[PDB]
Amino acid sequence: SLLSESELPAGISYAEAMEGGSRPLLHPDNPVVFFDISIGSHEAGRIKIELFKNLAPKSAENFRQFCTGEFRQNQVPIGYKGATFHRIIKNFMIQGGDFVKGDGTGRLSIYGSSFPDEAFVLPHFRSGLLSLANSGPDTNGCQFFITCAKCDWLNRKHVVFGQVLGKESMQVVRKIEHVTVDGGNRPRIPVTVTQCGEL
Amino acid sequence: XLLVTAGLVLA
């Protein structure tokens, strides 16, 4: 059920996404969330993200709850506030959301330890898409990546479930993408979601 | 390679 890049629905081309504000473009009921990013101790700006509930409802809702603080463990909220980007690969993608361990080993979802892959509808056809990181089939948790180039080799192995909205969002993505990293692609200076929520 | 895993990063 993977769509080719000529069967893509309206509202998700790069140009369309860059015209987006705070409301969804693919389907009117898709939630829009945000991250405020700090690079080191410096405010870098806001990434706004449409979550494709219409195509990947379980993936969208997992991410959404981690943005708003609605998901609790024994009455303790857990989510993306304070989470970092631990793996940054220029010209490829930026990876983050490991609030469990901060190093890429963490996996927790709102549904349990993991959740299965939803249908692979959208391809990794351009920069600015949100997709699930995993460790093989049916191992989605909390980590995600934002594409910094097309990466269609990932199709049918990672669910594309959102898109960044507006030009500032992509500017922030590009800023994160270009920070200095070590030989393991970990940033030398931390990149952190200092605030997040729903618009 | 250029994958996005969570635990064993492969080439």
Residue numbers in the entry:
A (entry chain B): 13 to 211
B (entry chain D): 1 to 11
Quote the study's own text.
Recently, we characterized TgCyp23 among the various Cyps of the parasite, demonstrating its high PPIase activity and its ability to bind cyclosporin A (CsA), a well‐known inhibitor of Cyps (Favretto et al., 2023). TgCyp23 exhibits the typical eight‐stranded antiparallel β‐barrel structure, with two α‐helices flanking the barrel on either side, all of them connected by loops. TgCyp23 shows remarkable sequence identity with human CypA (~52% of identity) but has a 40‐aminoacid N‐terminal extension. Here, three new structures of the protein in complex with the three non‐immunosuppressive derivatives NIM811, dhCsA, and Alisporivir have been solved at 1.17, 1.20, and 1.20 Å resolution, respectively.
Dihydrocyclosporin A (dhCsA), a closely related co‐metabolite of CsA, presents a saturation of the double bond of the unusual amino acid (4R)‐4‐([E]‐2‐butenyl)‐4‐methyl‐N‐methyl‐(L)‐threonine (MeBmt‐1) in position 1, has minimal reported immunosuppressive activity, and serves as a control in determining the role of immunosuppression in CsA‐based treatment of parasitic infections (Chappell et al., 1987; Meier et al., 1990). CsA derivatives with modifications at residue 1 (such as dhCsA, which is a co‐metabolite of CsA used as a control to determine the role of CsA in pharmacology) have also shown decreased immunosuppressive activity without compromising Cyp affinity, even though the MeBmt‐1 side chain is positioned in the part of CsA involved in the binding of Cyp (Aebi et al., 1990; Mikol et al., 1993; Rich et al., 1989). NIM811, dhCsA, and Alisporivir are attached to the CsA binding pocket. The backbone for these three derivatives is nearly identical to that of CsA. Remarkably, all the modifications in the non‐immunosuppressive derivatives are exposed, protrude from the binding site, and are not involved in the crystal packing. In all cases, the asymmetric unit is composed of two monomers with almost identical structure (RMSD values between 0.112 and 0.141 Å for the Cα superpositions). Remarkably, both NIM811 and dhCsA closely resembled the TgCyp23:CsA complex, implying that chemical modifications at position 4 of CsA exert negligible influence on the binding to the protein. Specifically, Alisporivir displayed the highest interaction affinity with TgCyp23 (Kd = 15 ± 3 nM) while dhCsA showed the lowest affinity (Kd = 200 ± 92 nM). The binding of all three compounds also had a significant impact on the thermal stability of the protein, leading to an overall increase in the melting temperature (Tm) of TgCyp23, as observed through both differential scanning calorimetry (DSC) and circular dichroism (CD) analysis. This effect consistently correlated with the higher binding affinity of Alisporivir and NIM811 to TgCyp23 compared to dhCsA, as determined by ITC analysis. All three compounds inhibit the catalytic activity of TgCyp23, with IC50 values between 0.8 and 2 nM, with Alisporivir having the highest inhibitory activity.
